[PDB]
Design an enzyme around this catalytic site. Structure first.
Site, PDB file in Angstrom:
ATOM      1  N   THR B  29      21.299   9.674  24.411  1.00  0.00           N
ATOM      2  CA  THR B  29      21.586  10.069  25.781  1.00  0.00           C
ATOM      3  C   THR B  29      20.575   9.436  26.728  1.00  0.00           C
ATOM      4  O   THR B  29      19.511   8.986  26.301  1.00  0.00           O
ATOM      5  CB  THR B  29      21.533  11.600  25.942  1.00  0.00           C
ATOM      6  OG1 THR B  29      20.282  12.087  25.445  1.00  0.00           O
ATOM      7  CG2 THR B  29      22.668  12.257  25.172  1.00  0.00           C
ATOM      8  N   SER B  30      20.920   9.394  28.010  1.00  0.00           N
ATOM      9  CA  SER B  30      20.049   8.818  29.028  1.00  0.00           C
ATOM     10  C   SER B  30      18.669   9.463  28.937  1.00  0.00           C
ATOM     11  O   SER B  30      18.553  10.686  28.830  1.00  0.00           O
ATOM     12  CB  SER B  30      20.648   9.053  30.418  1.00  0.00           C
ATOM     13  OG  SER B  30      19.853   8.463  31.430  1.00  0.00           O
ATOM     14  N   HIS B  88      14.036   5.210  22.843  1.00  0.00           N
ATOM     15  CA  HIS B  88      14.348   6.047  21.696  1.00  0.00           C
ATOM     16  C   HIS B  88      13.721   5.288  20.531  1.00  0.00           C
ATOM     17  O   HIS B  88      13.375   4.117  20.673  1.00  0.00           O
ATOM     18  CB  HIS B  88      15.869   6.154  21.498  1.00  0.00           C
ATOM     19  CG  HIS B  88      16.267   6.807  20.208  1.00  0.00           C
ATOM     20  ND1 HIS B  88      15.718   7.995  19.773  1.00  0.00           N
ATOM     21  CD2 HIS B  88      17.167   6.441  19.264  1.00  0.00           C
ATOM     22  CE1 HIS B  88      16.262   8.333  18.616  1.00  0.00           C
ATOM     23  NE2 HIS B  88      17.145   7.407  18.285  1.00  0.00           N
ATOM     24  N   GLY B  89      13.562   5.950  19.391  1.00  0.00           N
ATOM     25  CA  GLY B  89      12.990   5.284  18.237  1.00  0.00           C
ATOM     26  C   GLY B  89      13.133   6.084  16.958  1.00  0.00           C
ATOM     27  O   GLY B  89      13.633   7.213  16.968  1.00  0.00           O
ATOM     28  N   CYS B 130      10.546   8.486  19.625  1.00  0.00           N
ATOM     29  CA  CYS B 130      10.561   9.325  18.438  1.00  0.00           C
ATOM     30  C   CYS B 130      10.229   8.502  17.203  1.00  0.00           C
ATOM     31  O   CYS B 130      10.403   7.282  17.196  1.00  0.00           O
ATOM     32  CB  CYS B 130      11.932   9.984  18.289  1.00  0.00           C
ATOM     33  SG  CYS B 130      12.243  11.164  19.617  1.00  0.00           S
TER      34      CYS B 130
END
Lengths: 4, 141, 95
Positions: B29-30, B88-89, B130
């Site tokens: 998500t954004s 993100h990750g 993450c």
């Protein structure tokens, strides 16, 4: 608060 | 000899990759609030005299390209290098807007033997992403 | 006469290996919020590892998730400093  | 030489003409570059919007397939998500982070970092490092360059919503291919190009610049007159990744990750992975990129692929461009103008100089990678799906429930103190 | 090719890198991770990292939609990520705050307050004096240690404490003590979904509620976070640095790093120089 949101995650990532 | 206990402290890095930081009196070169320039403190160095501060590359900020700010990924907020991702392709549906990623299911991410954004990343609401990331622009606040990007602005905060820009001002913070500007104050430290770093040459800040902000990039928004880069695909994984673009991230690699940017990193490659930056590593090929002449950093001779720069004291250090800073790269901030906001996305993100997963463990060992950072996300381009369209998919994952191994962090090792990104940092490898700056190895002491692959970026000679940075050999012996501090190379900082700040990573907001993450590293898995575990939660820390904490403990009362 | 030579140094490791992996030397002189510092990876300031927002969270520990295997864990989620938290971001507030209005204030930004807990880690970046704290990092910038500690750099603004201490970069003119403290060595980088010590600044990052204060960031660890700030994130660890001043933040706790709040969510209408009990599954994402009351969670904590600790950043992860990974240093292959060979010297102390100060963001200033003594003329």
């Amino acid at each position: 608060d949101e995650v990532x | 000899d206990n402290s890095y030489k930081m009196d070169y003409p320039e403190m160095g570059l501060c590359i900020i990759i700010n990924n907020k919007n991702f392709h549906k397939s990623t299911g991410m998500t954004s990343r609401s609030g990331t622009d606040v982070d990007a602005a905060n970092l820009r001002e913070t490092f500007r104050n430290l005299k770093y040459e800040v360059r902000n990039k928004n919503d880069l695909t994984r291919e673009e991230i690699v390209e940017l990193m490659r190009d930056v590593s090929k610049e002449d950093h001779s007159k720069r004291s250090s290098f800073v790269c901030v990744l906001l996305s993100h990750g997963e463990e060992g992975i950072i996300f381009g807007t369209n998919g994952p990129v191994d962090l090792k692929k990104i940092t490898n461009f700056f190895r002491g033997d692959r970026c000679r103008s940075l050999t012996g100089k501090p190379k900082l990678f700040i990573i907001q992403a993450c590293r898995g799906t575990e939660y820390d429930c904490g403990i009362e103190t | 006469h030579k140094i490791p090719v992996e030397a002189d890198f510092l990876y300031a991770y927002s969270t520990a290996p295997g864990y989620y990292s938290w971001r507030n939609s209005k204030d930004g990520s807990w880690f970046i919020q704290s990092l910038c705050a500690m750099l603004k307050q201490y970069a003119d004096k403290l060595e980088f590892m010590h600044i990052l240690t204060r960031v660890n404490r700030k994130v660890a003590t001043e933040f706790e998730s709040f969510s209408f979904d009990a599954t994402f509620h009351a969670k904590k976070q600790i950043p992860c400093i990974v240093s292959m640095l060979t010297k102390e790093l100060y963001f200033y120089h003594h003329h």
